Amino acid sequence: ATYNVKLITPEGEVELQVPDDVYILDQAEEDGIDLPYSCRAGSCSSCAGKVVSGSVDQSDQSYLDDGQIADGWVLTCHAYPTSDVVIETHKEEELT
Ligand code: FES
């Protein structure tokens, strides 16, 4: 399947279609949309975002704890969409 992913960036909303087997960061980059990252391995805070609605699979990220996951935090470099999803990006500072 492929899902509608709305990214609310610091400079506005942009929508893109992300296959369920492509990481959200990776699709964004291919579609010309600059999101922050560092490790691209699921083990830092750089690519942090917060889910507004919808769901992702980020099993196999390691940095976020269950508290942070329960509060909607997502590492965009190691997250696949599992429904249409709305995600605020560039949220490291708020995490961190
Ligand atoms: S860029 Fe480090 S966890 Fe995503």
From Swiss-Prot:
<keyword id="KW-0150">Chloroplast</keyword>
<dbReference type="GO" id="GO:0046872">
    <property type="term" value="F:metal ion binding"/>
</dbReference>
<keyword id="KW-0813">Transport</keyword>
<feature type="domain" description="2Fe-2S ferredoxin-type">
    <location>
        <begin position="3"/>
        <end position="93"/>
    </location>
</feature>
<feature type="binding site">
    <location>
        <position position="77"/>
    </location>
    <ligand>
        <name>[2Fe-2S] cluster</name>
    </ligand>
</feature>
<keyword id="KW-0934">Plastid</keyword>
<keyword id="KW-0479">Metal-binding</keyword>
<comment type="similarity">
    <text>Belongs to the 2Fe2S plant-type ferredoxin family.</text>
</comment>
<dbReference type="GO" id="GO:0009507">
    <property type="term" value="C:chloroplast"/>
</dbReference>
<dbReference type="GO" id="GO:0022900">
    <property type="term" value="P:electron transport chain"/>
</dbReference>
<feature type="binding site">
    <location>
        <position position="39"/>
    </location>
    <ligand>
        <name>[2Fe-2S] cluster</name>
    </ligand>
</feature>
<keyword id="KW-0408">Iron</keyword>
<feature type="binding site">
    <location>
        <position position="44"/>
    </location>
    <ligand>
        <name>[2Fe-2S] cluster</name>
    </ligand>
</feature>
<comment type="function">
    <text>Ferredoxins are iron-sulfur proteins that transfer electrons in a wide variety of metabolic reactions. Occupies a key position both for transferring the photoreducing power to Fd-NADP(+) oxidoreductase (FNR), hence the formation of NADPH, and for mediating the cyclic electron flow around photosystem I (PSI).</text>
</comment>
<dbReference type="GO" id="GO:0009570">
    <property type="term" value="C:chloroplast stroma"/>
</dbReference>
<protein>
    <recommendedName>
        <fullName>Ferredoxin-1, chloroplastic</fullName>
    </recommendedName>
</protein>
<keyword id="KW-0249">Electron transport</keyword>
<dbReference type="GO" id="GO:0051537">
    <property type="term" value="F:2 iron, 2 sulfur cluster binding"/>
</dbReference>
<feature type="binding site">
    <location>
        <position position="47"/>
    </location>
    <ligand>
        <name>[2Fe-2S] cluster</name>
    </ligand>
</feature>
<keyword id="KW-0809">Transit peptide</keyword>
<dbReference type="GO" id="GO:0009055">
    <property type="term" value="F:electron transfer activity"/>
</dbReference>
<keyword id="KW-0001">2Fe-2S</keyword>
<keyword id="KW-0411">Iron-sulfur</keyword>
<dbReference type="GO" id="GO:0009416">
    <property type="term" value="P:response to light stimulus"/>
</dbReference>
